From Swiss-Prot, chain B:
Function field: Tumor suppressor probably involved in transcriptional and post-transcriptional control pathways. May be involved in cell cycle progression through the regulation of cyclin D1/PRAD1 expression. Component of the PAF1 complex (PAF1C) which has multiple functions during transcription by RNA polymerase II and is implicated in regulation of development and maintenance of embryonic stem cell pluripotency.
Mod. after translation: Phosphorylated. Dephosphorylated by PTPN11.
Subcellular location, record wording: Nucleus
Protein name: Parafibromin
Organism: Homo sapiens
Tissue-specific expression: Found in adrenal and parathyroid glands, kidney and heart.
Family to which this protein belongs: Belongs to the CDC73 family.
Gene name of this polypeptide: CDC73
Disease: Hyperparathyroidism 1: An autosomal dominant disorder characterized by hypercalcemia, elevated parathyroid hormone (PTH) levels, and uniglandular or multiglandular parathyroid hyperplasia, adenomas, and carcinomas.
Subunit details: Component of the PAF1 complex, which consists of CDC73, PAF1, LEO1, CTR9, RTF1 and SKIC8. The PAF1 complex interacts with PHF5A. Within the PAF1 complex interacts directly with PHF5A. Interacts with POLR2A, CPSF1, CPSF4, CSTF2, KMT2A/MLL1 and CTNNB1. Interacts with a Set1-like complex that has histone methyltransferase activity and methylates histone H3. Found in a complex with BCL9L or BCL9, CDC73, CTNNB1 and PYGO1 indicative for the participation in a nuclear Wnt signaling complex. Interacts with PTPN11. Interacts with SETD5. (Microbial infection) The PAF1 complex interacts with Zika virus French Polynesia 10087PF/2013 non-structural protein 5/NS5. The interaction with viral NS5 proteins may reduce the antiviral immune response by inhibiting the recruitment of the PAF1 complex to interferon-stimulated genes, thus preventing their transcription.
Domain of life: Eukaryota
Length: 78, 75, 47, 115, 258, 66
């Protein structure tokens, strides 16, 4: 029973690619077949597009509550 | 497949014939298809309404090909 | 093994000035002196 | 401090191919010839000679970046004649044109002096 | 499809310039031949200067630069010398260079003009243009100033440095009358007639010719004195012919190199 | 400072013409006839001798640091 917007804000997408790229650079397992690119940013992007990034966004509301949204649950903009 | 060149090259199909390839808009195009003579169709992950014009473009291109080059074939 | 030759100012005459020596010309006592051109290799492209 | 030495417009480095051919993907019978260490002196003559070929559908060239020592000539000919031979021939006979010019100029010169 | 049949007709030939007309050739070929006259025509020019001693009012690099720009008589040695970078010898040798020496000191009361007559040369065929009129002033020296330097002249071409450019001015021109309208005049009658205009003084520009290519390319190649002005043109043609022979070689190899 | 060796625009040698030009001007030649005498036809070359200022003659007034 979540009320925030079901779309991924440009900031959420940015910080997700930033953090997930850094995790890939630290060789956390990648969720999707590398065709052979090696720039962690390109892999993180490929994950996102395949909706396999293992991150949930904890969106704080002004009152103090929060709603966890799987990256696979909400809609990507670009 | 016939027309497959004995060396394993499929070009006798794709270079003489108007090919199609269905992919998501976002997915980086397949390197074989991009080298091959094949028409890319871009589909949205969430905007179902944009599907109809894409398939219309398919029937449009197919009809162009059938009428110009294979109109003698029977429909 | 050079005594460190300098060129006077108003005189233009080579004087040997060692370290711990006051810069004074051997003649006329002018205090301005210039070092003589280097002996190192000088090569230019002429470009 | 960052001035490139003037030789870089014509001297070949380690690994540089004088010419590199790549097939063009968007259409049949079309290649991209990439000359390294060359400029418009070679690009305009080859482009123009390619256009005299009645079997050449498209012929032209660009310098991808003027400070990059690389040029791209693009050729596309009828399906019954590969771009490779289009290039080859247009140079095969362009060399002849320049030799023919050399021979004709040499005789015109010897004919002008005391003649 | 095959090669067109070019022609030539020299109208004026002096020891300073050549005026010639080329027919039956492409617009690109005529301009590329011009470009070769400027950039890709080898000549001998000073490219290495060891300044032993310089006390003149001109600085060491100033002197070097000026020496670099002096035209040398490059008519037979340039086609025989090997490019210095291509030459196998360490330092310099006769196979890749012409040594020059200039040791000068002013002792006389009057100022000494250090012209190119002071540039002694190790070869009799390569010298500053002084064969047969004043000389290029390199420096002016006072009493007690000197300039002693060694120099080597290398085979180079105008694409690397302007010093190796054999031409003073190349006057390339085609279609004197505006028959192809390649240039559109706001007021055609304000424009003086070209030197080659086959046009009476009544009409301004030739009537428009819809179907017509550029031919009859008029040239005026003026030499700087390094190369005879007709030898500049021959040197262009041999150099371009080599460029195409070598490019076809590299191309043919790249075709087989699959 | 000193007459340039070559015309900056085209490349014609003009370094051997400053003394000649001075001699022509020592005669009553107008600088335009002087330039025609020296064979400078293009305005780019004429600009070299018309605009040149010979400062090396001033720099030579100083005694050298021999
Ligand atoms: Zn003194
Ligand atoms: Zn050598
Ligand atoms: Zn000029």
């Amino acid at each position: 029973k979540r009320i925030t917007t079901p779309y991924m804000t440009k900031y959420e997408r940015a910080r997700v690619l930033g953090t997930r790229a850094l995790q890939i650079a630290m060789c956390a397992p990648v969720m999707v077949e590398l065709e052979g690119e090696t720039d962690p940013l390109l892999i993180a992007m490929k994950e996102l597009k395949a909706r396999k990034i293992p991150i949930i966004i904890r969106r704080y509301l002004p009152d103090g509550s929060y709603e966890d949204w799987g990256v696979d649950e909400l809609i990507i903009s670009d | 497949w016939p027309w497959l060149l004995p060396d394993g090259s499929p070009v006798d199909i794709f270079a003489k014939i108007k090919a199609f390839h269905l992919k998501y808009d976002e997915v980086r195009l397949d390197p074989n298809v991009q080298k091959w003579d094949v028409t890319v169709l871009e589909l949205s992950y969430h905007k179902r309404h944009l599907d109809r014009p894409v398939f219309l473009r398919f029937w449009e291109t197919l009809d162009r090909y059938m009428v110009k080059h294979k109109s003698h074939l029977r429909f | 093994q050079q005594p460190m030759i300098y060129i006077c100012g108003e005189c233009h005459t080579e004087n040997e000035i060692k370290s711990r020596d006051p810069i004074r010309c051997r003649e006329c006592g002018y205090r301005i002196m210039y070092k003589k051109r280097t002996k190192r290799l000088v090569v230019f492209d002429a470009r | 401090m960052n001035a490139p030495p003037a030789f870089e417009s014509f001297l070949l480095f380690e690994g540089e191919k004088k010419i590199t051919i790549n097939k063009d993907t968007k259409v049949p019978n079309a290649c991209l010839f990439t000359i390294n260490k060359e400029d418009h002196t070679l690009g305009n003559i080859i482009k123009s000679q390619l256009l005299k070929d009645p079997q050449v559908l498209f012929a032209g060239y660009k310098v991808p970046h003027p400070l990059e020592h690389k040029i791209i000539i693009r050729v596309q000919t009828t399906p019954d004649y590969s771009p490779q031979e289009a290039f080859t021939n247009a140079i095969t006979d362009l060399i002849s044109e320049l030799s023919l010019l050399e021979e004709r100029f040499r005789v015109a010169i010897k004919d002008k002096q005391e003649g | 499809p095959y090669a067109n049949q070019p022609t030539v007709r020299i109208t004026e030939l002096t020891d300073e310039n050549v005026k010639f007309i080329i027919e039956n050739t492409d617009l690109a070929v005529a301009n590329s031949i011009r470009r070769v006259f400027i950039a890709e025509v080898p000549i001998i020019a000073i490219d290495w200067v060891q300044i032993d001693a310089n006390s003149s009012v001109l600085h060491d690099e100033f002197i070097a630069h000026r020496l670099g720009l002096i035209p040398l008589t490059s008519d037979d040695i340039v086609d025989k010398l090997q490019y210095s970078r291509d030459c196998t010898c360490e330092e310099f040798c006769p196979e890749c260079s012409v040594e020059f020496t200039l040791d000068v000191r002013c002792n006389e009361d009057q100022t000494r003009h250090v012209t190119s007559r002071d540039l002694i040369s190790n070869s009799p065929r390569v010298i500053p243009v002084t064969s047969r009129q004043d000389d290029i002033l390199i420096v002016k020296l006072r009493k007690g100033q000197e300039l002693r330097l060694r120099a080597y002249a290398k085979k180079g071409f105008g694409k690397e440095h302007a010093k190796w450019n054999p031409t003073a001015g190349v006057a390339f021109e085609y279609d004197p009358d505006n028959a192809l309208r390649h240039t559109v005049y706001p007021k055609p009658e304000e424009w003086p007639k070209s030197e080659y205009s086959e046009l009476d003084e009544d009409e301004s520009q030739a009537p428009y010719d819809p179907n017509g290519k550029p031919e009859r390319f008029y040239y005026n190649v003026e030499s700087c004195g390094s190369l005879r002005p007709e030898t500049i043109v021959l040197s262009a043609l041999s150099g371009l012919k080599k460029k195409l022979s070598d490019l076809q070689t590299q191309l043919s190899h790249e075709i087989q190199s699959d | 400072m000193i007459i340039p060796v070559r015309c900056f625009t085209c490349g014609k040698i003009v370094g051997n013409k400053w003394e000649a030009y001075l001699g022509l001007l020592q005669a009553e030649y107008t600088e335009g006839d002087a330039l025609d005498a020296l064979g400078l036809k293009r305005y780019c070359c004429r600009r070299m001798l018309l605009a040149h200022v010979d400062l090396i003659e001033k720099l030579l007034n100083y005694a050298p640091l021999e």
